[PDB]
Amino acid sequence: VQLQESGPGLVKPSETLSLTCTVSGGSINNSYWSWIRQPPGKGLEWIGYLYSSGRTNYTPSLKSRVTMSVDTSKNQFSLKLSSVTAADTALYYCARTHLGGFHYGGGFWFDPWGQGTLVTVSSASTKGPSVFPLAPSSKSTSGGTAALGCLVKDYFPEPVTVSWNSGALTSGVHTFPAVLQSSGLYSLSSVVTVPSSSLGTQTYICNVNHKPSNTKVDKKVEPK
Amino acid sequence: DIVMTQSPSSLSASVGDRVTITCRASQSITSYLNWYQQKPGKAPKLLIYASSSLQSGVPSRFSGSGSGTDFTLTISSLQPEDFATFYCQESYSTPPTFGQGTKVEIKRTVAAPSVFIFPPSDEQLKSGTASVVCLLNNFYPREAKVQWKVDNALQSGNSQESVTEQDSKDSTYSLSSTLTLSKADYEKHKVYACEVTHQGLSSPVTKSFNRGE
Amino acid sequence: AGTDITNQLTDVKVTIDSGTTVYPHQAGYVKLNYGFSVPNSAVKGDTFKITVPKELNLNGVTSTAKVPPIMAGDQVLANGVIDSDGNVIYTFTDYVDNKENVTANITMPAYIDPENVTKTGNVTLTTGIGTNTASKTVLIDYEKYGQFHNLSIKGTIDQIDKTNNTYRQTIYVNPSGDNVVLPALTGNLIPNTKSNALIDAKNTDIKVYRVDNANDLSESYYVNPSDFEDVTNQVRISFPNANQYKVEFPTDDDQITTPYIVVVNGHIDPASTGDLALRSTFYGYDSNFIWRSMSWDNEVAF
């Protein structure tokens, strides 16, 4: 059973955040499901549960702003959060909710979880990145290893994902946390260290995806 | 919805060390306590449920114990790949309280940064900006200083940096620093240098290029 | 051959002894008292009748009633049986043959009949010998089921048969009509008691009924099964531990929203000198996933 959250990554203050959780490799029926969120660099906050029949329970502090619904025919359930402010900027997760029942003498737990989807509450407009090469050279070679990368500059909001060679290259990859520029736009670098000898014989491509702006770029990085 | 106190907020331990993380409930919650592991950039994952039940596929070096008000997560032999923030969660009632978290850092031998530098791309220069990047690869501990110089002029306030999370295999960090200039300014100067200070170096290491050359 | 000499008795004194309220489910009872003088002309085989009202029976928690013999010193003056109307017919022995100035007293407990008195409220009880009657208005109070948060339960014992070593217990689960998630019922012996109940797959028989209209439930715990929906085949009955049963109530949405009636026909251990001491425990979650239980104890002294 796998869960996947989806929905706009940017919402304006005072409007409504809407997310959907899609269940695959199993059925949504005859089970409880929860939404849980996490502001960047902070802890976890449970929002509410839904049973597949449609009954719900929302955390008291959010109840007046929350709606959860289910479409069992589509194997999906949803969250709506109204009157949003910057305080609602967070990673939103869905999770299957298990009850211990008689055997465990009570209790409950969350498993599995979705991947999480970031929602940013802001009046600012989305902007897709420019992608520039960090080309390898003698200035990025040492001890049998060379370094190359991609600079993902001037986007809003977070996040961006970067893969290498469509996910075939994972070893030695470092994708750094973004920095917020004084322009109000983010910038990020992704680097990979490879055998020095491979610069001549292997093609390296960074795959950048900025889902909030629907901007995808595949950039080949060649030696200097 | 019970007040929880998770301790400690962070710890650093060597591979093979025994690690304990504790959770205290403000009233008795019987056996209603779960433990989650959250790796960098990943969702939380259930490790232990109902105080002591191990999730399938989770190594047996992880064990949970306790009842009533006091619960313990034990790692009998810390491994590199265990790097994470761990959270307890009470399940006495909705809304469930999550603990404040414990960041587990792995202590290892000193590793010196390998220092690499990248000039701005011609493509970027065309659009009117220059980004110069300095990379510090695979070092430990985390504390490092980068200093930018342009024709021996110390740069102050025109760079930004970020650091990776501890690597799951070798427990090192990497750091990227970007110096920003306008195209016009970039083309007025020759020597671009980043100077790195770190415990694993005998003295500050400079890595530079000459624009063009 | 034998004469009904009811009308020839004299000095007939009839009393109903009770408090203001009778609590049948606390095994409360009234005392019926009859005193009279017997005519000198009375002989063996002569009879008299005690009229007992439909609101009362003489058996109570036991399956059959035994009418006490009327005594004259250490000799039997009369033997009694209960007729098909529920009245008592006493037949005089040969004690009265060649005796004058014969008088008698007899007391017997009587119990509120749960089929005839299904609800809490006042009833007027009338009993008599001939046209000599006594009446008393009493409150019959069956009280209320137990409740802890969203969990409600109550049970009562009847049909104790000490010859065949059987008993019946009738339990209402969720009579409050709450939502209960993942409900379970266990039936047990009361702790810290010598209990004579045998609870196991051989000795215990359980039927379960769904209650689609809670207003149909008697307060007296009289149950006619045809009034409800038999769902025995849809519940899960097991015996996970010694002298315990468990009933689970699986549903498509993992909760119940209606009452259920659980009817237990069980056995007694004839080797035991203990009391019939039973504990019913109802378990479940509320909507905040708080897991609770609540118990109801039934005990009949042996």
**DSSP string across B84-148:** EEEEEEE-SSSSPPBP--EEEEEE---BPPEEEEEPPPHHHHHHTEEEEEEEEEEEBSS--EEEE
Tell me whether A108 touches chain C (CB under 8 Å): yes
DSSP, collapsed to helix, strand or coil, labels residue B14 as: strand
Task: Label residue C241 left, alpha or beta by phi (over 0 means left) and psi (-120 to 50 means alpha).
Answer: beta
A50: Cα within 13 Å, side-chain hemisphere: 23
**Looking at the structure, do residues A136 and A113 belong to the same domain, yes or no?**
no
Cβ-based contacts of B94 with chain C (< 8 Å): 288-289
Burial (CB < 10 A; 0-12, 13-18, 19+), residue A71, is exposed
Q: Look at residues A93, A121, A149 and tell me which one is the last residue of a structural domain.
A: A121
Beta pairing class for B191-197 and B145-150: antiparallel
Q: Hunting for tokens 């509120």 — which residue is that? A: C112
**Could you tell me the domains of chain B?**
4-107 (2.60.40.10), 114-210 (2.60.40.10)
Would you list the DSSP string of C94-131?
Answer: GGGTT--S-EEEEEEEEEE-TTT--SSEEEEEEEEETT
CA distances from B75 to A72, B21, B32, B98 (A): 40, 9, 20, 20
| One domain, residues A104 and A140 | no
- Whether A99 sits inside 8 A of C182 (CB atoms) is yes
Task: Tell whether A46 is within 8 A of chain C (Cβ).
Answer: no
Check if the beta carbon of residue B153 is closer than 8 Å to that of residue B159.
no
Question: What gap in Å lies between CA B114 and CA A17, rounded to an integer?
Answer: 44
Mention every residue, 6+ apart, whose C-beta is less than 8 A from residue A79: A17, A18, A19, A21, A35, A47, A66, A67, A68, A92
Find which of B30, B94, B97 to mutate to test the C interface (most C CBs within 10 Å of its CB).
B94
Residues A182 and A76 in one domain: no
d(CA A105, CA A111) in angstroms, rounded, equals 19
The answer to whether the CB atoms of C289 and A108 lie below 8 A apart is yes
Rounded Cα gap, residues A180 and B178, in angstroms: 12
Cβ–Cβ under 8 Å, residues C17 and C33: yes
Q: Cα separations (Å) of A159 from A8, A120, A129, B177, C16? A: 12, 10, 11, 19, 87
CATH assignment of the domain containing A16: 2.60.40.10
A44: chain B residues, CB-CB within 8 Å: 44, 87, 89, 98
Classify residue C252 by burial, with Cβ atoms within 10 Å: 0-12, 13-18, 19+.
exposed
Cα–Cα distance, C44 to C2 (Å, whole number): 8
Exposure on the CB side of residue C34, measured as CA atoms within 13 A: 26
CB-CB under 8 Å, A109 with B118: no
Q: Where are the domains of chain C?
A: 6-140, 146-300
What whole-number distance in Å separates Cα of residue A82 and Cα of residue B170? 45
Nearest to B2 by CA among B26, B24, B20, B38: B26
Q: Is A205 in contact with A221 (CB distance < 8 Å)?
A: yes
Rounded CA Rg of chain A:
21
In Å, how far is C184's CA from the nearest CA of chain A?
7
CA distances in angstroms from C4 to C46, C47, C91, listed in the order given = 6, 5, 9
Query: Counting beta carbons within 10 angstroms of the beta carbon of residue B108, is it exposed (0 to 12), middle (13 to 18) or buried (19 or more)?
Result: middle
Q: Is B200 exposed, middle or buried (0-12, 13-18, 19+ CB in 10 A)?
A: middle
Residues A111 and A197 in one domain: no
Distance of residue B173 Cα from the nearest chain A Cα, in angstroms: 10
Sheet of A161-164, strand order: A161-164, A204-210, A215-221
Q: Are residues A160 and A101 in the same domain?
A: no
CB contact under 8 A, A99 and C285: yes
C-alpha span between C220 and C123 (Å, rounded): 14
B70 Cβ contact partners less than 8 Å away, ≥ 6 residues apart:
B22, B23, B24, B25
Residues A113 and A137 in one domain: no
Task: Tell me: do A45 and A150 sit in the same domain.
Answer: no
Length of chain C: 302
CA distances from B188 to B128, B192, C2 (A): 14, 11, 141
The partner residue sitting opposite B98, judged by closest CB among A44, A135, A176, is: A44
Q: Does C4 touch chain A (CB under 8 A)?
A: no
Give dist(CA C181, CA A108) in Å, integer: 13
Distance between CA A36 and CA A32 in Å, rounded? 13
Q: Which of A88, A121, A154 is the last residue of a domain?
A: A121
DSSP summary character for residue C233: G
What is d(CA A207, CA A217) in angstroms, rounded to the nearest whole number?
6
C251 touches chain A (CB under 8 A): no
Nearest CA in chain C to B94: C288
Comparing alpha-carbon positions, the chain A residue that sits nearest to C240 is A103
Which CATH code fits C6-140?
A: 2.60.40.1280
From first CA to last CA, the distance across chain C in angstroms is 42
Give the nearest partner residue to C184 out of A102, A107, A108, using CB atoms: A102
- Judged by CB atoms closer than 8 Å, whether chains meet at A100 and B91 is answered as yes
Phi, psi of B77 (to 5 degrees): -150, 100
Give the resolution to one decimal, in Å. Answer: 1.6
Please list every residue in chain A whose beta carbon sits closer than 8 Å to the beta carbon of residue C285.
99, 101, 106
Max Cα-Cα span within chain B: 71
| A62 and A112 part of one domain | yes
DSSP structural state of residue B9: S
Q: Is A167 on the interface with C (CB under 8 A)?
A: no
Q: What Å distances lie between residue C256 and A108, C109, C294, CA to CA?
A: 19, 41, 16
Q: How many CA atoms lie within 13 A of C262 on its CB side?
A: 30
Query: Subunits touching C (CB < 8 Å, at least 3 pairs)?
Result: A, B
The CA distance from B3 to B96, in Å, is 10
Task: Give the Cα separation of B27 and B97 in Å (integer).
Answer: 12
A39 and A142, same structural domain?
A: no
Claim to verify: residue A43 and residue A138 sit in the same structural domain: no
Whether C6-140 shares its CATH topology with C146-300 is answered: yes
**Cβ atoms within 10 Å, residue A174:** 22
- Chain A residues with beta carbon closer than 8 angstroms to that of B209: 139
**CA C73/CA A51 separation, integer angstroms:** 75
Name the domain boundary from A63, A90, A121.
A121
Rounded Cα distance between C275 and C196, Å, is 6
> Pseudo-torsion of CA C252, C257, C258, C261, nearest 10°?
70
> How buried is C195 (Cβ within 10 angstroms: 0-12 exposed, 13-18 middle, 19+ buried)?
buried
CB contacts, 8 Å: B1 with chain C: 288
User: Which chains contact A through at least 3 pairs of Cβ atoms less than 8 Å apart?
Assistant: B, C
User: Total domain count for chain A?
Assistant: 2
Closest in A30, A55, A105 to C291, CB measured: A105
Q: Which chains does B contact via 3+ CB–CB distances below 8 A?
A: A, C
Phi, psi torsion values for B159, nearest 5 degrees: -130, 155
The CATH number that domain C146-300 falls under is: 2.60.40.1290
C-alpha torsion A7→A9→A15→A18, nearest 10: 20
Query: How far does A82 lie from chain C, in Å, by closest CA?
Result: 23
Q: Any idea of the CA torsion for C112, C116, C118, C123, to the nearest 10 degrees?
A: -60
Residue C252 has which token pair?
A: 């498509």
DSSP A25-91: SS--TT-EEEEEEE-TTS--EEEEEEETTS-EEE-TTTGGGEEEEEETTTTEEEEEE-S--GGG-EE
Method: X-ray
Supply B118's token pair: 């990248």
Q: C208 vs chain A: nearest CA distance in angstroms?
A: 20
CB B102 within 8 A of CB B10: yes
Same domain flag for A167 and A62? no
Question: Do residue A100 and residue C291 have CB atoms under 8 angstroms apart?
Answer: yes
Residues C231, C186 contacting (CB under 8 angstroms): no
Best interface-test mutation with A: which of B5, B53, B103, B135 has the largest number of A CBs within 10 A?
Answer: B135
Preferred mutation among A102, A104, A108, A110 to probe C, highest tally of C CBs within 10 A: A102
**Same domain for A115 and A43:** yes
Of the candidates A106, A109, A141, which has its C-beta nearest B49's C-beta?
Answer: A109
Label the pairing between strands A66-71 and A76-81: antiparallel
* Residue A27 structural domain: 2-121
Q: CA-to-CA distance for C164 and C161, rounded, in angstroms?
A: 6
* Phi, psi at A6, each rounded to 5°: -150, 150
The token duo for C286 is 């509320």
| Per-residue DSSP letter, A15 | S
Beta-carbon contacts of residue B149 (< 8 Å; ≥ 6 apart): B155, B191, B192, B193, B194, B195, B206, B208
| Nearest-neighbour CA in chain C from B92: distance (Å) | 6
Number of H helices, E strands in chain B: 2, 18
Count CA atoms within 13 Å of residue C286 on its CB side. 14
Q: Any CB–CB contact under 8 A between A107 and chain C?
A: yes
The residues, ordered by sequence, that sit 6+ positions from A179 with a Cβ below 8 Å of its Cβ are A186, A187, A188, B160, B161, B162, B178
- B93 in contact with C, Cβ within 8 Å: yes
Structure tokens at A87: 């305080």
Q: Which of residues 271-290 of C touch B (CB under 8 A)?
A: 288-290
| CA torsion angle B155 B160 B165 B169 (round to 10) | -50
Option in B34, B117, B163 nearest A109 (CB): B34
Q: In angstroms, rounded to a whole number, what is the distance separating the alpha carbons of residues C39 and C101? A: 8
